[PDB]
Design a protein around this ligand. Structure first.
Ligand code: ATP
Ligand code: MG
Ligand code: ZN
Lengths: 218, 98, 292, 190, 157, 86, 288
């Protein structure tokens, strides 16, 4: 906010601009981050559009539904308890987690032999319990263009902060989970940037507010 | 007290004058001025080591016809002083008044 | 009830529309011209921004024969709202030259159309004045100065002419022949000082004249005015003793600072002279050895 | 006929009385209704006005208009207070007639009086001759204090008495058990 | 009529040239301050300039009037009135006033007229003119440059 | 001061070549050699500045408070982490 | 008569101020309003004042030509004078520049089929600055006069040829569809005398000395800054001995030149100090 009538707005194209605002837009609701509309000719702020949801995030959270419930899962009853003590308990009883003093857990890395229920459990969690589920494939994040393999993760974690509680669930993470090479090629180097971006937005210079991450691999 | 302050004028006073003009003893004048200041009649300050009661702004009074002439003459003198100062200022710095 | 009468701000467009109105309807002498003062309010500083013409009529007779159209106010209101809904009626103005009898009476007609207390704006449209030709007069009810029934009368407010971005551009373009854009800072401040002194002298002469009138009883005796004058006299400081010494010591310090600053300016001029002489010598050498 | 008219209704304390049921105020409102309707039927181009002669100095309630909505809303918001300064009201009505939107409609005034005319007689005759000079036609419908008003009403009409122009018609109908607009329909109008 | 008005004013000025009739002066000056058409005002100004041809001291008035007038077209006529009153004389009152107008004025048209008038006044001292106008010929305002070009053209004809 | 309209492109000053020219890098991506406006405080043209550029000409026309172009912001109090040395 | 190039549109102060106020209030919508004036003659188009047409929900297109509003405003402006014609229309083009578009051309055609001499003045509140308000009227070319190639322009005077057509305006087509006109704001002595009041201070502010503590803190701070700047000046003079001109031409581009700061501080503090002394003395003498 350079002045009352001079703003520094970015553009989806990429260039920055020094843009004069209209007369009806409430100047109070103009801080770092708010999306605005720019007139194509004179580049003048018009509207105060709310936060954005990347289409590659709605395409993730808008999975069908899943008809299997916790009854359909058999044999797995102790591990169901262990998972539910992190998925359901913090989201519906954040008082025992206070007087006892435990820091609420964030990640639950389901793992086992291929074909025991590591994905069916996630489908049950999506159907049962609740909270805004975000199913995440491993390779469904990686894009050809530079940086977009990390911007997608950034929007994935930003959507959760505005939809608390969130149960973000990656899958087959051994695609972007590999032990970072020391002499890998160019392809394996851009992925490591994505692994850094994912890594920081769990314990970095910020606290994950109410986001739980479920993580499955073979 | 108020009428003597307004007649005798003088921003200062004395304990003896107030005692004579109010019939109170020279020891009760202090409490008299206490009441006067507290009630808002004056805004002065006492001094007992040397009895030199100091007076400031006094409660206003309705102005009679005679007082108008004195105030008018004082206005005339003030306006003449202002006009002379303005004339001197204009004459001295006419090179930069643009 | 809102107390919003502390400060009044007028954009030049309202006033110029007033002048255009007066020169348009061919108003001769004694014929006042009246319009509305559309603007924004509900804040401490009442701000006038736009105006329009009104079909005000009045014969120079009994003060109650004044006529003014009621439908015109609302009809202008609707169109102006269509153009801009941020400008609301905040009263009325008359084309000077001074307050008249019906000002209190007609103000009540605008009570319903206005939301707050209607604002009166006197406009010296024919320009007999020397200072600002605009002054505000909000009608308020206060006790009589003569110890009689409380009266609903006008109160003067400090009015300052100030323009916004839209109108400052036009004002600066229009008078871009007489304004001294060079001027100088200290010179313009000293000119302002002299103008303020002359204004003080004029107001003093007016007060003296009014007192001269009241001693001859052409006007009644107002005890509030006399009390204010006596307060003015009481507040007059006596200089010609402790205050005198404090003022003298401050003036001496201030002159010492002036001395230091002038010394700095002189040394800056010295460096400028040295550099300029060096460059002149270099130019002379250049021309001499390139000619030969 | 294109005829710009103003209706000087009276809301004085005497006009509050109820010799005509319900009240002289309500009867005056009904007469205003009838006059507006008749003028509309004669020609819709004619514009009518509403000026109240009471409530301190007279206050204009609406300018020359042909729509009943605004004036009728004004009729519901004019309290019965003050006296009838009919001289100032007539002067104001004359002032309004200068600003007809149609500058061809002839000037007409119909005034309702329900209180004594306690005005300067010479000034009243001067006003009447001024109205005649401007070709202004005035009609006065008297019901109420007929014993006094009729001393100055005939003088007004004999001072106006337009022979060839719009002739002024006086009505001093004594309070009777018939509808007021029926009484005013024939004699003053036609 | 704005099409015949300019020519009518110019012919009226030419017919009474040099005479300085005290009636045509008043008539044309009064009429110049009424006509809304722009062309007629300048035509009357030039006619007034032609009227005062030769009458050096007699045309001291109409110079205080027109060079202090409000309509920017009338000062354009004041410049030419100075040019034709003190024509071929080099009188210094006219030259000083012409310079003051040529530097201190808003309408550049009047600046050009004033510089052309300066060139007209010193026609009997053609040696000097390229010395006074040398400073004129380097001003930022282009109208002054055109004026001094015309002044040279008139002087050293 | 008319070129300072309010469509503008933020650039980054790189090197002052002359008194009235400079090498700016517009946000569009490519560097330019442009003429600096003769009203700016030329003492503020520090390298890697946040000067503004005219839309179609790229002539430098305004210098900005150098804490404005920043996409990264100084950590204030809403993001103040809540751990201690203890 | 094939018009002429010396035609000039005379805009009064009221018209220009209303134009700018209405243009700045609708950025970036291209608001439009009519233009009340009179046709003095073939060469002059007087303009008295303007009033605003409402901006319908169209956005950035000048197409709301509502007739009810125009008729009502014209008819009941007559009640208080302003008996004038519908000479032209003005619409603001904020940001782009002064030039007509196809929609503007169609609207001006509509106006020409009613008056045939209607100007199309185009304000531009965004790129206007205090002294160079950009304004220029337009009027459409005839039609098939391009067969004669004599677009209506008889250069019987140089007063029309002096103005130079804009560069980007020609891109949209200036001499191809609408020959440009001249613009001459005509003032009045009453208006220019008294618009001076915008920069006339209140009378009771000249003799007002400000609080006598800031006038000492400011002096002390200025003196300390002067000391530091003098030290920097000493080091500047020391460093200047061994520098070549190709650097000094660009040396003080990015760092504080410790000479203009010294002069600016000296002049500012001396002006403030002189004003303070004069105010103090003047009030001490005259007020008493
Ligand atoms: N406990 C269980 N009860 C019933 N069916 C089960 C159970 N565990 C797994 N399944 C079956 O597993 C299938 C779902 O895939 P599954 O859970 O075997 O994959 P996964 O091990 O998570 O895969 P990946 O190796 O890709 O990580 C379904 O057909 C479901 O019937
Ligand atoms: Mg699986
Ligand atoms: Zn357009």
């Amino acid at each position: 906010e350079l002045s009352e009538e001079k703003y520094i707005v970015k553009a989806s194209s990429g260039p920055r601009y020094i843009v004069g605002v209209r007369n009806s837009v409430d100047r109070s609701k103009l801080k770092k981050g708010v999306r605005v509309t720019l007139d194509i000719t004179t580049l003048t702020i018009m509207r105060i559009l709310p936060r954005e949801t990347d289409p590659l995030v709605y395409n993730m959270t808008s999975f069908e539904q899943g008809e299997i419930t916790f009854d359909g899962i058999g044999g797995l009853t102790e591990q169901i308890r262990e998972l539910r003590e992190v998925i359901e308990l913090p989201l519906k009883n954040p008082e025992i987690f206070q007087r006892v003093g435990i820091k609420p857990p964030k990640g639950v890395l389901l793992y086992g032999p291929p074909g025991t229920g590591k994905t069916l459990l996630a489908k049950a969690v999506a159907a049962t319990i609740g909270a805004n589920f975000i199913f995440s494939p491993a390779s469904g994040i990686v894009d050809k263009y530079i940086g977009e393999s990390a911007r997608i993760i950034r929007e994935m974690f930003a959507y959760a902060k505005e939809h608390e509680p969130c149960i973000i669930f990656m899958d087959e993470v051994d695609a972007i989970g590999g032990r970072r090479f020391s002499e890998g090629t160019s392809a394996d180097r851009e992925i490591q940037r994505t692994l850094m971006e994912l890594l920081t937005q769990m314990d970095g210079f910020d606290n994950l507010g109410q986001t739980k991450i479920i993580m499955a691999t073979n | 007290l108020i009428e003597t302050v307004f007649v005798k004028n003088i921003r200062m006073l004395s304990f003896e004058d107030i005692s004579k003009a109010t019939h109170l003893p020279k020891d009760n004048v202090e409490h008299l001025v206490m009441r006067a200041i507290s009630l808002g009649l004056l805004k002065g300050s006492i001094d007992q080591v040397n009895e030199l009661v100091t007076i400031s702004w006094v409660q206003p009074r309705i102005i009679s016809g005679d007082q108008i002439t004195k105030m008018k003459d004082r206005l005339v003198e003030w306006n003449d002083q202002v006009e002379k100062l303005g004339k001197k200022m204009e004459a001295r710095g006419q090179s930069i008044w643009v | 009830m809102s107390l919003q009468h502390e400060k009044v701000t007028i954009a030049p467009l309202v006033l110029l529309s007033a002048l255009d109105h007066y020169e348009r309807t061919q108003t001769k002498e004694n014929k006042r011209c009246v319009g509305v003062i559309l603007g924004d309010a509900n804040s401490s500083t009442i701000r006038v921004t736009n105006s329009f013409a009104l079909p005000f009529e009045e014969d120079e007779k009994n003060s109650d024969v004044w006529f003014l159209d009621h439908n015109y106010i609302e009809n202008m209101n609707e169109m102006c709202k269509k153009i801009n809904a941020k400008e609301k009626l905040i009263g009325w103005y008359h084309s000077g030259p001074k307050l008249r009898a019906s000002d209190l009476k007609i103000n009540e007609l605008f009570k319903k159309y206005t939301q707050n207390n209607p604002l009166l704006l006197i406009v010296d449209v024919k320009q007999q004045g020397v200072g600002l030709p605009t002054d505000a007069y909000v009608a308020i009810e206060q006790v009589k100065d003569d110890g009689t029934s409380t009266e609903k009368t006008f109160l003067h407010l400090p009015c300052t002419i100030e323009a916004e971005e839209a109108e400052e551009i036009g004002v600066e373009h229009l008078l871009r022949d007489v304004r001294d854009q060079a001027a100088g800072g200290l010179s313009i401040r000293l000119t302002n000082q002299l103008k303020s002194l002359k204004g003080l002298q004029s107001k003093l002469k007016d007060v003296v004249e009014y007192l001269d009138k009241v001693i001859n009883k052409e006007l009644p005796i107002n005890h509030t005015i006399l009390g204010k004058l006596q307060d003015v006299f009481n507040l007059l400081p006596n200089l010609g003793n402790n205050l005198q010494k404090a003022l003298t010591v401050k003036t001496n310090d201030e002159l010492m600072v002036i001395y230091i600053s002038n010394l700095v300016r002189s040394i800056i001029a010295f460096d400028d002279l040295i550099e300029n002489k060096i460059q002149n010598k270099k130019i002379q050498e250049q021309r001499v050895k390139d000619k030969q | 006929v294109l005829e710009a008219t103003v209706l000087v209704i009276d809301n004085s304390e005497y006009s509050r009385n109820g010799d005509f049921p319900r009240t002289r105020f309500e009867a005056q409102i009904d007469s205003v209704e009838f006059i507006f309707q008749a003028k509309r039927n004669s020609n819709p181009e004619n514009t009518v006005g509403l000026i109240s002669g009471a409530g301190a100095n007279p206050r204009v309630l609406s300018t020359f208009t042909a729509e009943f909505g605004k004036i009728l809303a004004g009729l519901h918001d004019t309290q019965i207070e003050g006296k009838l300064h009919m001289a100032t009201a007539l002067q104001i009505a004359q002032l309004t007639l200068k600003h007809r939107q149609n500058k061809v409609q002839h000037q007409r005034i119909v005034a309702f009086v329900c209180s004594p005319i306690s005005d300067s007689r010479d000034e009243l005759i001067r006003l009447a001759k001024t109205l005649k000079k401007n070709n202004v036609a005035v009609d006065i419908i008297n019901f109420g204090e007929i014993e006094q008003n009729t001393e100055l009403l005939d003088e007004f009409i004999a001072a106006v008495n337009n022979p060839q122009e719009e002739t002024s018609h006086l009505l001093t109908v004594t309070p009777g058990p018939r509808l007021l607009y029926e009484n005013i329909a024939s004699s003053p109008i036609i | 009529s704005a099409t015949s008005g300019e020519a009518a004013a110019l012919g009226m000025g030419l017919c009474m040239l040099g005479t300085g009739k005290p009636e045509a002066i008043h008539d044309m000056f009064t009429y110049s301050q009424e006509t809304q058409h722009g062309n007629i005002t300048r035509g009357l100004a030039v006619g007034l300039a032609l009227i005062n041809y030769g009458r050096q001291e007699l045309a001291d008035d109409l110079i205080t009037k027109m060079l202090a007038s409000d309509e920017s077209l009338l000062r354009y006529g004041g410049a030419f009135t100075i040019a034709l009153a003190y024509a071929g004389t080099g009188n210094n009152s006219a030259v000083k006033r012409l310079l003051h107008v040529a530097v201190s004025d808003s309408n550049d048209d009047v600046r050009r007229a004033a510089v052309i008038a300066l060139g007209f006044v010193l026609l009997r001292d053609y040696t000097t003119v390229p010395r006074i106008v040398q400073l004129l010929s380097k001003s930022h305002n282009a109208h002054v440059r055109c004026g001094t070009a015309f002044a040279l053209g008139i002087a050293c004809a | 001061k008319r070129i300072q309209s309010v469509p503008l492109v933020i650039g980054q000053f790189l090197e002052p070549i002359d008194q009235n020219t400079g090498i700016v890098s517009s946000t569009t991506g490519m560097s330019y050699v442009v003429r600096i406006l003769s009203t700016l405080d030329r003492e503020l043209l520090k390298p890697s500045m946040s000067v503004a550029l005219h839309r179609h000409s790229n002539a430098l026309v305004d210098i900005l408070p150098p804490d404005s172009d920043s996409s990264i912001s100084v950590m204030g109090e809403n993001e103040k982490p809540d751990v201690t040395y203890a | 008569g094939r018009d002429d190039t010396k035609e000039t549109v005379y805009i009064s102060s009221i018209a220009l101020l209303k134009m700018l106020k209405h243009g700045r209030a609708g950025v970036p919508m291209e608001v439009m309003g009519l233009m009340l004036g009179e046709f003095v003659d073939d060469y002059t188009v007087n303009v008295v004042d303007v009033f605003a047409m409402p901006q319908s929900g169209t956005g950035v297109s000048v197409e709301a030509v509502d007739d009810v509003f125009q008729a009502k405003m014209m008819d009941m402006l007559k009640q208080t004078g302003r008996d004038q014609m519908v000479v032209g229309w003005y619409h603001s083009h904020p940001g782009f520049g002064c030039w007509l578009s196809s929609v503007d051309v169609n609207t001006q055609k509509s106006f020409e089929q009613l008056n045939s001499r209607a100007v199309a003045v185009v304000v531009d509140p965004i790129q206007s600055v205090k002294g160079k308000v950009v304004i220029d009227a337009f009027r459409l070319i005839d039609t098939g006069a391009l067969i004669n190639n004599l677009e209506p322009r008889q250069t019987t005077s140089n007063t029309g040829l002096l103005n130079k057509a804009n560069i980007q305006a020609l891109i949209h087509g200036l001499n191809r569809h609408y020959y440009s006109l001249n613009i001459d704001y005509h003032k009045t002595a009453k208006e220019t005398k008294m618009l001076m009041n915008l920069h006339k201070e209140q009378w009771q502010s000249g003799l007002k000395m400000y609080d006598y503590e800031e006038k000492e803190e400011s002096n002390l701070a200025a003196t300390k800054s002067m000391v530091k700047i003098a030290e920097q000046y000493s080091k500047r003079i020391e460093e200047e001995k061994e520098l070549t001109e190709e650097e000094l031409k660009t040396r003080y581009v990015g760092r504080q030149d410790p000479k203009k700061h010294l002069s600016e501080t000296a002049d500012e503090t001396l002006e403030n100090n002189i004003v303070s002394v004069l105010t103090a003395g003047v009030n001490s003498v005259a007020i008493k």
